[PDB]
Amino acid sequence: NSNICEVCNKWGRLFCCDTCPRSFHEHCHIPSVEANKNPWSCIFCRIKTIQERCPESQSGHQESEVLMRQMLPEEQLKCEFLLLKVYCDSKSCFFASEPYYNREGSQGPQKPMWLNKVKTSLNEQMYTRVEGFVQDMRLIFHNHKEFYREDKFTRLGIQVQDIFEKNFRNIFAIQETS
Ligand SMILES: [Zn+2]
Numbered sequence: 001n002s003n004i005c006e007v008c009n010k011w012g013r014l015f016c017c018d019t020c021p022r023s024f025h026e027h028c029h030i031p032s033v034e035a036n037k038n039p040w041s042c043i044f045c046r047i048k049t050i051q052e053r054c055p056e057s058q059s060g061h062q063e064s065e066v067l068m069r070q071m072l073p074e075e076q077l078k079c080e081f082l083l084l085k086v087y088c089d090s091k092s093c094f095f096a097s098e099p100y101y102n103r104e105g106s107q108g109p110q111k112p113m114w115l116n117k118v119k120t121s122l123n124e125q126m127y128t129r130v131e132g133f134v135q136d137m138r139l140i141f142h143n144h145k146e147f148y149r150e151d152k153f154t155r156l157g158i159q160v161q162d163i164f165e166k167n168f169r170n171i172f173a174i175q176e177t178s
């Protein structure tokens with residue numbers, strides 16, 4: 001197995017996947033690494049299994065159809081993995097914890113949002129459809145773009161949104177377009 005966490009790329013107290021060489025900190029993995037379970041399979045392995053059990057799940061889909069899916073166990077897992085893929089990028093640090101807004105010439109967002117809040121919301125089964133999760137994720141970056149206006153820091157929002165959207169299209173097998 002790897003000797004660094006797959007998500008944050010640091011050593012420490014790592015839990016190792018039994019079916020692939022990835023390792024994780026307890027709370028870097030999503031869901032948090034399960035207490036018992038020997039063997040244990042990580043989220044990457046669990047997603048690969050879904051795909052292997054239903055190869056047709058990789059044919060293209062319309063985003064509108066994906067968004068209306070109810071959060072049954074497989075869609076719950078897919079959203080957890082997509083959230084994890086965003087945390088895998090180091091620039092996710094800027095969006096993880098609860099933000100505050102005091103900048104001359106800008107007003108804070110009406111509905112603040114951040115990664116750890118989405119993480120809690122998934123953990124507590126607060127989303128009933130994929131749309132709920134995707135909306136909160138997109139709102140993180142939209143809030144950031146609006147607040148930082150012409151400051152070059154706005155680019156961080158664009159960058160992390162691009163990681164989110166690329167992973168969304170991959171995980172949910174959105175039909176490729178120009
Ligand atoms: Zn970690």
Ligand SMILES: [Zn+2]
Pocket residue numbers: 017018019020021022041042043044045
């Ligand atoms: Zn694995």
Ligand SMILES: [Zn+2]
Pocket residue numbers: 053054055056
């Ligand atoms: Zn099948």
